[PDB]
Design a protein around this ligand. Sequence first.
Ligand SMILES: N[C@@H](CCC(=O)O)C(=O)O
Lengths: 50, 48
Amino acid sequence: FLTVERMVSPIESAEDLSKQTEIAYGTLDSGSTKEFFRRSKIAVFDKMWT
Amino acid sequence: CGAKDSGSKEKTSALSLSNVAGVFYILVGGLGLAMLVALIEFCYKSRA
Ligand SMILES: N[C@@H](CCC(=O)O)C(=O)O
């Protein structure tokens, strides 16, 4: 361990945000991304928007 | 499908028990064998 020091991010899969609650996340207000989350029916994206 | 490896990663971490599990098997086998040897030696030395 004291030789190789891999970091690894805690939200690698970009879907972990839908299950974790210790990291807040948001988008620009009044933008294309907010409307995309507001309208998309994808299950994971529905979770993020919710 | 349910392989789905996620969450805490042992690869970034310690040896699991599965890496050294053979040593515990050897240890308990040795303990059982030692109790067996003691019992057969006692059985020999007893009844007389
Ligand atoms: N700003 C553009 C594109 C998004 C971006 O900034 O990457 C929009 O409102 O949709």
